[PDB]
Amino acid sequence: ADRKAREAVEMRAQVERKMAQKEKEKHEEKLREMAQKARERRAGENRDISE
Amino acid sequence: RPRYSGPAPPPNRFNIWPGYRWDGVDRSNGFEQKRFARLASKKAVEELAYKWSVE
Amino acid sequence: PPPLLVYKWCQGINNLQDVWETSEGECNVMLESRFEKMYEKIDLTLLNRLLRLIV
Amino acid sequence: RNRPLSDEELDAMFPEGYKVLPPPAGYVPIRTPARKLTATPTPLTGFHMQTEDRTMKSVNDQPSGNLPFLKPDDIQYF
Amino acid sequence: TRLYLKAEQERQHNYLKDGPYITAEEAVAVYTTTVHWLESRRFSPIPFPPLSYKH
Amino acid sequence: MNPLTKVKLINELNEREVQLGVADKVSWHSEYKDSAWIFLGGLPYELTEGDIICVFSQYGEIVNINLVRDKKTGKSKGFCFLCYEDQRSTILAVDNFNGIKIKGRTIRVDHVSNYRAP
Amino acid sequence: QWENSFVSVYSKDNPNLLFNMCGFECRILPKCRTSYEEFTHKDGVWNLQNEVTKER
Amino acid sequence: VWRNTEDEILKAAVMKYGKNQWSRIASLLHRKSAKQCKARWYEWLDPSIKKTEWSREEEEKLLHLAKLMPTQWRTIAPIIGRTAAQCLEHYEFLLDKAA
Amino acid sequence: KEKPSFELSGALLEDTNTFRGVVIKYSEPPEARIPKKRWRLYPFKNDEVLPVMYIHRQSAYLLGRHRRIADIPIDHPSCSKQHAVFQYRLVEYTRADGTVGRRVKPYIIDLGSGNGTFLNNKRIEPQRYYELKEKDVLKFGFSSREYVLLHESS
Amino acid sequence: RLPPEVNRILYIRNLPYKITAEEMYDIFGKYGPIRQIRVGNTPETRGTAYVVYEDIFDAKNACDHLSGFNVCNRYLVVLYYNANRAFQKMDTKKKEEQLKLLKEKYGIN
């Protein structure tokens, strides 16, 4: 039972790592799209100041 | 009477206000806080040793 | 402390949903017991595996 | 005292029986980036069973015999 | 006490002569179910206490 | 003996007083209920009265200050006298500032009995 | 074992819901059911004030 | 630890006094405690401690058991007739020559 | 000769705000703080994007041309040595229910830098704090590089 | 703010035999610039390492942080070095000539 459990836990660990990595990657490319979109919209007072 | 207004004057025995133009940073040998801490701890051990006296 | 635990438990029972309603024929049941022998029956080797899961 | 040193300075610091290494010329170039922009970097578990091994049991921290306990700071001497 | 210790010596030797009473199916069920829970709690297993330990 | 030993002296004196736990009315300070002037020594040759007063105001207001510089070249001789408003403030200053390191130079602070007005 | 457990039931036929925790033996009595008067008493009596509504 | 002199005094004291009054016995030697005397006697001294090397069959049994009942040496050691110390170190030795 | 003044002298100032032999002009005010929301700086140079910097980790960040003491050396010779200070400040606000709250807020401040800091391409007042909001753009002096500020959900 | 025994010289025990200097330069690399690294060779020194940072500050950071690191199923021993003795002369010749270079170089005296 220990052998079987060790291996099942590994397999689940790998599937989880992979899914989380993929999601992180899509989030990163999305945030890059947002970054360059916003920088360009700027290329084309809801503000806070002090003394 | 321009009086100190900045953040926080550390305590003293006499609790006197720092001067008009106190440059406003603590430069002190710390002997103040040493004496304060020892002052409290003396009372602490007084109590602790009494509790033994009655035992 | 245990008595605060008792208070916590009471008012926990109280804040349930509709706990005191008995209209539609509900019934609450509080049961409480011991495990009647846990120490004397812990089995050494199997306990060893269950600890290897932790430390 | 913070002044950097020479290689002769180092060979006067260190005892014998130690081989000098730059591992790569790329790691030595990573070493060039080491001080470079260290603060800026990309940020930095779960459950996982263990596997039996002996290296921890193997490591020893006290001399063997009728030997007195050897403190943690007398190490670089003894 | 003497009566108790006699009962015990008995009950240990009986366990040895009559094998673990928790058969094997029950052992495997318990074990596996614990593992399911822990892993579903992402519980990092505690590690043997390093020597130059902070605390 | 060179003056840093004379800082060691006053600090040892204070700690010994606390060590015997002696009461304040018989504390060695008590012999100067009659002076608001305190001597500063070992000041770096750069500090001017602005900085001195700024820093030492930390325990009160200053009535007067006299920083002995050499008149012919005007330059600071590195020691001064300070008249606080109220003796208690000088007691605090003698306790706390005796031994502080300003620009590397460990300054020594003390009471003054018979301050001479120059 | 049934000899040491102790099972108490709250139903239309039982107003009092009993139980027995760490050292105390307690009886819970709702104001909805046959608590005709809400009352004061020796401080042997706690009031389980409902949380969301703050009522007795 | 124990020195051969204390050891011999132990042998004689036991054979005289019987296994049951360890207080008198430990009173005899200085820097020795009754608990220690009892432990040492049952562990090493008593004649029933069989002092030889392990047969192949004995090591088969040992290994097999320590696989069957992890880390329970005071449970095993009666089953192969040696002390917990013998079983323990000797299993360590087999394990090290294997790896 | 010189008459005794009552004016100041950098002595205390120098020792207290000195580092590495390069005295810094700015001090962290008491509301220095570190944020929960993890802020990221997206650098660009004429539409070429540069790797992001993760600046949620310190309360103060020095930007300038002096690589020694600056957090961020912005290598445009039109950048003065000690130029600008990014700073997290715990600034109070009102929660919509009226109860008073404070959030760690990112504020940039210039030390009278030579050629001007550009906030969304406006030159800002020196020795004064300016809040930075999501997506906002920055440019220092006349550098060919520009930056956009974001955080994790931004 | 430094306890004055801290140094850019660190001494490391419990080293896996035949680790890559690459691996190791990385390990100590997250902490600061490495002025140099040496590993023991003889069986006595084989497995111990003297690692020299170029800065006292990265030095203290590392020694305080990676202390007790788990590498290859073992915890790593770190220590500050007591460079309290010497093993060679200081080479008067080279010292003298480089200093002559300095003196004529900046026309000091």
How many Cα atoms sit within 13 Å of B36 on the Cβ side? 11
DSSP for residue I78? T
Number of domains in chain F: 1
Which chains are within 8 Å of C by 3+ CB pairs? E, G, H
- Residue J73 near residue D53 (C-beta atoms within 8 A): yes
Does residue D42 belong to the interface with chain I, where contact is any CB pair within 8 Å? yes
Among candidates F18, F60, F98 on the partner chain, residue whose Cβ is nearest the Cβ of B19: F60
* Touching pair J, I by Cβ (3+ pairs < 8 Å): no
CB-CB neighbors (< 8 A) of C44 in chain H: 69, 72
CB-CB neighbors (< 8 A) of D49 in chain A: 2, 5-6, 9
Which chains are within 8 Å of H by 3+ CB pairs? C
Residue J95 lies in a domain: no
Residue J103 lies in a domain: no
Exposed/middle/buried for residue I38 (C-beta within 10 Å: 0-12, 13-18, 19+): middle
How many Cα atoms sit within 13 Å of H69 on the Cβ side? 15
Question: What is chain J's length?
Answer: 109
- Residue F37 near residue F83 (C-beta atoms within 8 A): yes
- Residue I117 near residue I108 (C-beta atoms within 8 A): yes
Which chains are within 8 Å of I by 3+ CB pairs? A, B, D, F
Exposed/middle/buried for residue H88 (C-beta within 10 Å: 0-12, 13-18, 19+): middle
Inter-chain CB pairs, A–D, below 8 Å:
12
Exposed/middle/buried for residue I61 (C-beta within 10 Å: 0-12, 13-18, 19+): buried
Interaxial angle between packed helices A2-43 and E25-39, expressed in degrees from 0 to 180 and rounded to the nearest 10 = 10
Residue J75 lies in a domain: yes
Does residue D46 belong to the interface with chain E, where contact is any CB pair within 8 Å? yes
In sequence order, what DSSP letters do the residues of chain F get, joined into one string? Answer: --THHHHHHHHHHHHHHHHTT--GGGSGGGGGTT--EEEEE---TT--HHHHHHHHGGGS-EEEEEEEE-TTT--EEEEEEEEESSHHHHHHHHHHHTT-EETTEE-EEEE-SS----
- Any idea which residue has 């058969």 for tokens? E23
In sequence order, what DSSP letters do the residues of D47-58 get, joined into one string? Answer: --------HHHH
Cα J42 from Cα J44, distance rounded (Å): 5
- Cβ distance I9 to F48 less than 8 Å, yes or no, reads yes
Closest CA to F111 of F101, G40, F89, F103: F89
- Residue J77 near residue D70 (C-beta atoms within 8 A): no
**Bridge-partner residues for I92, per DSSP?**
I102
Does residue D61 belong to the interface with chain E, where contact is any CB pair within 8 Å? yes
Does residue H69 belong to the interface with chain C, where contact is any CB pair within 8 Å? yes
Give the chain B residue whose CA is nearest to the CA of I13.
Answer: B23
* One-letter amino acid of J30: K
CB-CB neighbors (< 8 A) of D45 in chain E: 42, 44
Q: Rounded to an integer, what is the distance from CA B37 to the centroid of its chain?
A: 8
Cα J39 from Cα D22, distance rounded (Å): 11
Exposed/middle/buried for residue B12 (C-beta within 10 Å: 0-12, 13-18, 19+): buried
Which two three-digit tokens encode residue D47? 């459950």
Interaxial angle between packed helices H84-98 and H73-80, expressed in degrees from 0 to 180 and rounded to the nearest 10 = 90
- Please name the residues in contact with E9: beta carbons below 8 A apart, sequence gap of 6 or more: none
- Please name the residues in contact with B30: beta carbons below 8 A apart, sequence gap of 6 or more: F96
Cα I87 from Cα H50, distance rounded (Å): 78
**In this structure, are strands I60-64 and I72-73 parallel, antiparallel, or unpaired?**
parallel
Resolution value, angstrom units:
3.4
**In this structure, are strands I146-151 and I137-140 parallel, antiparallel, or unpaired?**
antiparallel
- Residue F15 near residue F99 (C-beta atoms within 8 A): no
- Any idea which residue has 């497995």 for tokens? J47
* One-letter amino acid of H21: Q
Which run of H or E residues covers position H91?
helix H84-98
Across chain J, how many H-helices and E-strands are there?
A: 3, 6
Rounded to the nearest angstrom, the minimum Cα separation between C47 and chain H is 11
* I105 C-beta neighbours (distance < 10 Å), count: 20
Cα I44 from Cα I49, distance rounded (Å): 4
> Which method resolved this structure?
cryo-EM
* One-letter amino acid of D25: A
**Bridge-partner residues for F40, per DSSP?**
F80, F109
CB-CB neighbors (< 8 A) of I57 in chain D: 39
- Residue I140 near residue I74 (C-beta atoms within 8 A): yes
Cα J48 from Cα J77, distance rounded (Å): 9
Cα I113 from Cα I85, distance rounded (Å): 11
- Cβ distance E41 to D47 less than 8 Å, yes or no, reads yes
Closest CA to H69 of E13, C54, C48: C48
Domain, as residue range, for J30? 3-82
Give the chain D residue whose CA is nearest to the CA of J40.
Answer: D18
Does residue D42 belong to the interface with chain E, where contact is any CB pair within 8 Å? no
Closest CA to F102 of I9, D1, D56: I9
Which chains are within 8 Å of D by 3+ CB pairs? A, E, I, J
Cα D72 from Cα J44, distance rounded (Å): 19
Cα H36 from Cα J94, distance rounded (Å): 69
CATH number at residue J12: 3.30.70.330
- Please name the residues in contact with A16: beta carbons below 8 A apart, sequence gap of 6 or more: D46
Instruction: Give the SS3 label for residue J38.
Output: strand
Give the chain A residue whose CA is nearest to the CA of D48.
Answer: A9
- Cβ distance D48 to A13 less than 8 Å, yes or no, reads yes
Cα J80 from Cα B55, distance rounded (Å): 50
- Cβ distance F51 to I8 less than 8 Å, yes or no, reads yes
Question: What is chain C's length?
Answer: 55
Which two three-digit tokens encode residue A30? 């999305």
- Please name the residues in contact with C54: beta carbons below 8 A apart, sequence gap of 6 or more: E38, E45, E46
Cα E2 from Cα F76, distance rounded (Å): 94
Inter-chain CB pairs, D–I, below 8 Å:
10
Give the chain D residue whose CA is nearest to the CA of A10.
Answer: D48
Which two three-digit tokens encode residue B40? 């409290």
DSSP for residue I131? E
Number of domains in chain J: 1
* J36 C-beta neighbours (distance < 10 Å), count: 19
Q: Rounded to an integer, what is the distance from CA H46 to the centroid of its chain?
A: 9
Residue J27 lies in a domain: yes
- Any idea which residue has 């040492």 for tokens? H40
Does residue E52 belong to the interface with chain D, where contact is any CB pair within 8 Å? yes
Cα I58 from Cα I88, distance rounded (Å): 8
* F68 C-beta neighbours (distance < 10 Å), count: 13
Domain boundaries, chain H: 1-49, 50-99
Interior CA angle at J42 toward J40 and J48, to 5°?
30
* A18 C-beta neighbours (distance < 10 Å), count: 10
Cα B35 from Cα F19, distance rounded (Å): 11
Does residue F102 belong to the interface with chain I, where contact is any CB pair within 8 Å? yes
Instruction: Give the SS3 label for residue G26.
Output: strand
Which two three-digit tokens encode residue H74? 């005071």
Exposed/middle/buried for residue J8 (C-beta within 10 Å: 0-12, 13-18, 19+): buried
E31-34 LR contacts (CB < 8 Å, sep 24+): E31/A1, E31/A2, E31/A5, E31/C46, E31/C49, E31/C50, E31/C53, E32/A1, E32/A5, E34/C50, E34/C53
Which run of H or E residues covers position I44?
strand I39-45
CB-CB neighbors (< 8 A) of B7 in chain I: 30
Domain, as residue range, for F100? 3-118
Task: Name the region of J14 (left: φ>0; alpha: ψ -120 to 50; beta: rest).
Answer: left
DSSP for residue G51? T
CA separation (Å) from G17 to C20, I114, I116?
A: 10, 80, 76
Closest CA to F80 of F108, F99, F61, F114: F108
Which two three-digit tokens encode residue F101? 């390191």
Cα D55 from Cα J72, distance rounded (Å): 9
Closest CA to F85 of F62, F101, F104, F65: F62
Among candidates G6, G17, G48 on the partner chain, residue whose Cβ is nearest the Cβ of C32: G6
Does residue E51 belong to the interface with chain D, where contact is any CB pair within 8 Å? yes
CATH number at residue F14: 3.30.70.330
